[PDB]
Design a protein around this ligand. Structure first.
Ligand code: HDD
Ligand code: HDD
Lengths: 727, 727
């Protein structure tokens, strides 16, 4: 009709803007100048809308899209209304099966580039030159929950990267923990059925806190290592930008000379490692179930591109048997103290999709999608994964032509003798649909392996043994890796692990399952088992107290790279601060606050007891982003309260609770001038306490002190003090 | 190996048990004696498990379900492992498309029976005899969220009932509010796309609180009536057992004489009407996203069978045009003050399904599934619905044989000349697959319409008009029903409506959309418009302040049946109380508490600071249901704190917070003996306060008081005292 506002405020500016400043929008409209080879190749299918007539799918203009065709304006709808039927038909068949696992995920486009050529250890074209840019499409996910489930659950996270290389698609399909729960792919359905919602009633969603999961874990000790990781704060990342990524399996790099090197893939978050705390994470699934999806999208819209460093743990073929654990066992990590991660390149995620369904929901990643220069190993979990990811998209994406769905298409050439199949897009002109043929002079043709642009040939690994359904005896060790993880965590991390297990086991209705898990914990570490047992009202038996702890892992009694926080790696850029306003804010405090934050790339959200505007002491009109209840402290990293008319919000329950919640969840709090009246709400001594910034004004070192606290992420020293606190 | 506990505690007793007393289980194992014709008919496909060998789907016994077949124990997985491939293949294809709308839902089996024969107004067989029982299967749902989204969101709820009658399946596919948002089915995709997650980033899940929903609403005033209902506490029901159900459209009843009577269908909850409050509902989506699903399942396991009374609003054909609204407009309700709801029969849900996927997920309901004695009308929304529910299951349920999926099968005879289609189960022996035929003597044959067991014949409604895509002028009135609804709500219901709109519109990023919605509210009621505007920091113009309110609906200035709470309808059976234990509970208090609760069918959950057990003062061992943090006050209807060693929990942060949350959410709280010292936490009253029960001990009087409070659901008089509380 011409419904947009005449001031053009319905449309977000096509420039980087901080979270909440503008309505979010499709990537190609928000950042039209951000391009890459894959984004450019999608232009043949992108469809605009502005200034076009509304039509049917057959191109017929529609005159009246408000009404069905009927006999009389109060009459029956007629079967001849083809416009109505096409429209309802398309609607009626919008949904496709969600992914069996990792159904909940958020994605973005980006690019990768190696730091140096890796030609000495791999012939993979995408790693051959520092000036070779490879477009990527990354999808981060949870594991258990459906596509409509919440983001901040306690779960493993998926981290899948599609590399659109010149020699084929390479999908690095990893998780955020360096091991998996099980050893052989044959048990995948068992483990997944145990963690997913129980079959009689389909409860619970997005949670391993239920009987069948802990029943399985209790009977399958190989799971304990990844369970330790999920029970730690690793299971509740602050954002996809602040978690590590791992390929888990040992793969092979193959160079031009034919040498095979064992490799484990790593992704290091350039924003650092950071996680929530359980109470915050759980409440946040309620206050904002889309928190991670939203945060990823807004980071990219703000120019805070998620950046990751690809790294390789490399192990020579001659060292295959030199560790206490098997290199092919996916339940075992390779300690970085033994084999360092060598930095390989950087990945930058800089553009959101246009249409979530078309690009994210239909994206298909599969770890079998490798390119010359890479190869597999006999890891029995990886081996079975290779079967699943091609199979599953026959139903998920309707057939074998899923590589023709725009997001999945290679940007490099693809030609073969495969034909037909549902939804076939490619119209083949080859006279032949078979090889060998003479009628097209045998094109397209096979290509011999070679240093560059050659055909794929598997590494000639020696195979020797009988046909058996047998677990290698080298895989039968289940407690040393769990113990190594435990011992590498800080004391507050251990506490959170103890709390994770305790909370989850408390949701297990059958008490014997809790007892059985406690017995397993006693094989890992007595302190851990005792603390969990104590929280479950369970007493360890004398036998349990005397279980000998598992051996160190190759002499290591800890590896600090396993902790999120043991070694500081703080990065404040992209974090956000809640600013609690009053109706006569000291504008000077606000100016100092906002400019300090902006200088470090830290965002702010101005909150009040209503929407609209408030006027500062000097007449400055302050736009309100949200109310105290509307954007809870769960969604920010720190809270600042400027001086002004504090009596306005002093007796506001929501404003007081805002600080209590943020205080309980160990976030930095800064009070200027009369805002110090709120110290009594969080019980802060006159003298002050580490973790609370306070001064007569927001000047001098007030902002630097708060930013130092944000750099450390959370105020771990406050844990004992939050123990009480009714919040 | 891995086997059941010696003591048999892995398996739930097969008898009615209170929530939490036993692990939940498949219905046929929990209540094997609960039968009905439909449940029995599902016995052909029910599959046991105990004492049977594990096999492939082809019936081959599996020796080792722990490993893939490989060449050597550390070798490559072989392609000949068909056991692994079948198992992984079935896993890979588990998911089916979720429903386009109402994907989130919970179901149960039950039975219905009319109070008396309705043969004078309808020939429908299921309403013909008070002693003839009809098996039902009911699915309750939300609308917007995916199948993995949360239960206690703010949304409309679906209430679909499949009646397995002797003359065909009758599906009564309704919602929990008496009107829908839109008038013509052609706009269904528009409305649903606006409320669903926005297309660029697929946010937000299970929420209408986003720009596109309010944009659509602001441009389509026909939506305002159902929006009023959604924003009231109707949008966040306490349970599926405590909400009304409505068919929305005017349908027809056809008797044996051929007389048509207009009818609107109602379901009255025999447990009464009850809703949560927003803060509670929203937090509960995070603490227990499966709350309604769980609550329904547990109610049925406990014997608190959800019971509903079917009721009809009947309007003679000659009264079609006598209201000031069109009877065929689904955005208009029929005030009970004008046309009373006649009681028709009772529906009882007494058995949970066995497998959620097979029975709930694959259930197909469709409002076109009617039987002789019922008929449609020209309601333009209902008309388009008839097209869509058959159409959508061709993708959702994989084909046209969805009536052969066990839960969907009619229990009466079904014979026709339709053949084939994907996964055809029925093997037809008829020599003929067409009619007329002589080769099978024309069987199965058509049946003339008649008083009973007759063929379906449409009511011969007179149709007169030109072929038009036009809305009836009579549907062009959008503010009087919204205003009637507003004026019928109690003062606290009005405030919660105000808060609903305010909260939602505060999440609309484009400010002009908020203003346009406020403008629409000014057309309904200025008090309402002004209260919302104040919260958004918006000022009504002088023009807006002078908008004439819409006319009363046929002289009505209010209709108390539109309110949840104006007319007392409380029922405590099935409700649940949290009991905060201490390590030396005064058993005399507990005895009295449990006895009084038990006499009214109210359940209890014993909570503590840890799991396991605590021993009362008389040696009674009390098993702990959950921790204070583990089963928040959100999940209960009231909180009781018995005396004993109060020092044990007096300083516990979670225990204190438990009471503050319950207090803020207007729930009855009862404190006996030294537990009255908790009154300081909820900072209020010394002489007592209506809503807080206190006494030296828990006695008959104390429990009567608490139970009387529970019968009124929430303590609305405490509203003014809760916005200072920091919780
Ligand atoms: C044999 C089965 C199997 C096993 C053993 C694995 N999974 Fe897998 N996973 C699948 C079968 C599968 C799947 C059914 O094929 C999925 C679901 C739908 C899809 O396209 O792929 C998939 C999805 C999937 C995704 C989502 C890709 C997306 O965003 O689309 C990730 C990140 C992982 N998996 C990661 C892993 C890791 C790191 C594993 C252990 C090392 C693992 N999976 C074990
Ligand atoms: C023209 C399309 C159309 C319109 C105008 C309506 N819906 Fe509908 N509804 C559908 C198209 C549909 C559907 C696409 O066909 C669905 C999802 C898939 C399914 O089986 O049915 C459905 C599902 C569906 C369900 C879930 C049944 C279940 O539990 O499986 C309920 C309760 C409603 N609808 C009720 C309503 C009511 C009371 C409506 C308004 C008066 C309404 N729908 C308007």
């Amino acid at each position: 009709d011409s419904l947009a506002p005449e001031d053009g405020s319905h449309r977000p500016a096509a420039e980087p803007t901080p979270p909440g400043a503008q309505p979010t929008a499709p990537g190609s409209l928000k950042a039209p100048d951000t391009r890459n080879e894959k984004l450019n190749s999608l232009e043949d299918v992108r469809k605009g809308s502005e200034n076009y007539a509304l039509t049917t799918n057959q191109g017929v203009r529609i005159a009246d899209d408000q009404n069905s065709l009927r006999a009389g304006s109060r009459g029956p709808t007629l079967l001849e209304d083809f416009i109505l039927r096409e429209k309802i038909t398309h609607f009626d068949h919008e949904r496709i099966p969600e992914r069996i696992v990792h159904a909940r995920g958020s994605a973005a486009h980006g690019y990768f580039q190696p730091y140096k050529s890796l030609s000495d250890i791999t012939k993979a074209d995408f790693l051959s030159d520092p000036n070779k840019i490879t477009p990527v499409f990354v999808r981060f996910s949870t594991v258990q929950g459906g596509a409509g489930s919440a983001d901040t659950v306690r779960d493993i996270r998926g981290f899948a990267t599609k590399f659109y290389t010149e020699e084929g698609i390479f999908d690095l399909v990893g998780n955020n923990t360096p091991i998996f729960f099980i050893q052989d792919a044959h048990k995948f359905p068992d483990f997944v059925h145990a963690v997913k919602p129980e079959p009689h009633w389909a409860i619970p969603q997005g949670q391993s806190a239920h009987d069948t999961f802990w029943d399985y874990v209790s009977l399958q000790p190989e799971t304990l290592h990844n369970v330790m990781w999920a029970m730690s704060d690793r299971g509740i990342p602050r954002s996809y930008r602040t978690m590590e990524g791992f390929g888990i399996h040992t793969f092979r790099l193959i160079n031009a000379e034919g040498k095979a090197t064992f490799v484990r893939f790593h992704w290091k978050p350039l924003a650092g490692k950071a996680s929530l705390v359980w109470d915050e994470a759980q409440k946040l699934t309620g206050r904002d179930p889309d928190f991670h999806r939203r945060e990823l999208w807004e980071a990219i819209e703000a120019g805070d591109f998620p950046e990751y460093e690809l790294g390789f743990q490399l192990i020579p073929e001659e060292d295959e048997f030199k560790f206490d654990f098997d290199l092919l066992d996916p339940t075992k990590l390779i300690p970085e103290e033994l084999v360092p991660v060598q930095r390989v390149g950087k990945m930058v995620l800089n553009r959101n999709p246009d249409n979530f369904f078309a690009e994210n929901e239909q994206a298909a990643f599969h770890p079998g999608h490798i390119v010359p220069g890479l190869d597999f190993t006999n890891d029995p979990l990886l081996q079975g994964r290779l079967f699943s990811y091609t199979d599953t998209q026959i139903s998920r994406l309707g057939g074998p032509n899923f590589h023709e769905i725009p997001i999945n298409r290679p940007t490099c050439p693809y030609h073969n003798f495969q034909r037909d199949g549902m939804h076939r897009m490619g119209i083949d002109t080859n006279p032949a649909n078979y090889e060998p043929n003479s009628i097209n002079d045998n094109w397209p043709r096979e290509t011999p392996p070679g240093p560059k642009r050659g055909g794929f040939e598997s590494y000639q690994e020696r195979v020797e043994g009988n046909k058996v359904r047998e677990r290698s005896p080298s895989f039968g060790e289940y407690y040393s890796h769990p113990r190594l993880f435990w011992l590498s965590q800080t004391p507050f991390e251990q506490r959170h692990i103890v709390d994770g297990f305790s909370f989850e086991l408390s949701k297990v209705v059958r008490p014997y399952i809790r007892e059985r898990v406690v017995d397993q914990l006693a094989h890992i570490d007595l302190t851990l088992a005792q603390a969990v047992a104590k929280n479950l009202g369970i007493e360890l038996t004398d036998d349990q107290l005397n279980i000998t702890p598992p051996p160190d892992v190759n002499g290591l009694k800890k590896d600090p790279s396993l902790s999120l926080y043991a070694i500081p790696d703080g990065d404040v850029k992209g974090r956000v601060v809640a600013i609690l306003l009053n109706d006569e804010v000291r504008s000077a405090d606000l100016l100092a606050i906002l400019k300090a934050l902006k200088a470090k790339g830290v965002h702010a959200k101005l909150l009040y007891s209503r929407m609209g505007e408030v006027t500062a002491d000097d007449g400055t009109v302050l736009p309100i982003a949200a109310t105290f209840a509307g954007a809870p402290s769960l969604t920010v990293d720190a809270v600042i309260v400027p001086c002004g008319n504090i009596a306005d919000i002093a007796d506001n329950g929501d404003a007081n609770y805002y600080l209590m919640e943020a205080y309980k969840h160990l976030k930095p709090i800064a009070l200027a001038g009369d805002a110090r009246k709120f110290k009594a709400t969080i019980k802060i001594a006159d003298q002050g306490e580490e973790g609370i910034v306070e001064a007569d004004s927001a000047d001098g070192s007030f902002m630097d002190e708060l930013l130092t606290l944000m750099a450390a992420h959370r105020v771990w020293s406050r844990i004992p003090k939050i123990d009480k606190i009714p919040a």
